[PDB]
Design a protein around this ligand. Structure first.
Ligand SMILES: CC(C)CCC[C@@H](C)[C@H]1CC[C@H]2[C@@H]3CC=C4C[C@@H](O)CC[C@]4(C)[C@H]3CC[C@]12C
Length: 208
């Protein structure tokens, strides 16, 4: 094949193959009162989908069924994104309250149970991503005074009583910051159609 743009897809999907394997491997590490595990299995499914889809896309450099299956994977994923996009939009508070309950159970097990490497890693990343600590402003104090290894960066104890907690940012992420999720969703939508067109171009180009 003459076109090197077909050769680009191998590197692009191989990134998501390793990312799929890492996300799958990290999700299994977090697996190591079920709502916290309910959110963990979503990461297991996401990590497994990105692995086998990233497998077909990456291994598409070998050049077929393999490539044709990869194109069908992008079509079904695009239709499920539309379904998850419209439904997730109309139920924006349903998943928001579920992210709350996920964060609440993760924070409880991280503070009370000191041997919970999974609960700490989840809440710590939630803290570094949202600049929060504790569920309520009272939980911000209990976490900062006791389990300060969870609060993000060098945030002191006094700085958490005035800052907004995660139960404020989780809602603000879904309410005011829904434009951010819309961007990320469309970004996934435009890279799917871009890989879809480039997949049938590769199939029409590999014919020699
Ligand atoms: C389970 C729901 C509610 C959470 C959202 C899951 C999303 C973020 C996950 C699940 C499946 C994932 C996709 C799986 C396959 C591909 C094709 C690949 O070439 C680019 C990455 C891409 C497009 C992944 C993007 C992220 C993805 C869409």
């Amino acid at each position: 094949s003459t076109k090197s743009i077909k050769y680009l897809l191998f590197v692009f999907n191989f990134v998501f193959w390793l990312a799929g394997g890492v996300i799958l491997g990290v999700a299994l590490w977090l697996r190591h009162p079920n709502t916290f595990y309910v959110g963990i299995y979503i990461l297991i499914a996401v990590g497994a989908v990105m692995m086998f889809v990233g497998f077909l896309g990456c291994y598409g450099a070998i050049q077929q069924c393999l490539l044709g299956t990869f194109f069908t994977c992008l079509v079904i994923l695009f239709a499920c994104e539309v379904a998850a996009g419209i439904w997730g939009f109309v139920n924006k508070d349903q998943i928001a309250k579920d992210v709350k309950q996920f964060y609440d159970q993760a924070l409880q097990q991280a503070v009370v149970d000191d041997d919970a490497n999974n609960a700490k890693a989840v809440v710590k990343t939630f803290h570094e991503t949202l600049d929060c600590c504790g569920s309520s402003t009272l939980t911000a104090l209990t976490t900062s005074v006791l389990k300060n290894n969870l609060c993000p960066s060098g945030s002191n104890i006094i700085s958490n009583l005035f800052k907004e907690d995660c139960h404020q940012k989780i809602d603000d992420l879904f309410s005011g910051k829904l434009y951010l999720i819309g961007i990320a969703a469309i970004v996934v939508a435009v890279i799917m159609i871009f890989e879809m067109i480039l997949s049938m171009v590769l199939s029409s180009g590999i014919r020699n």
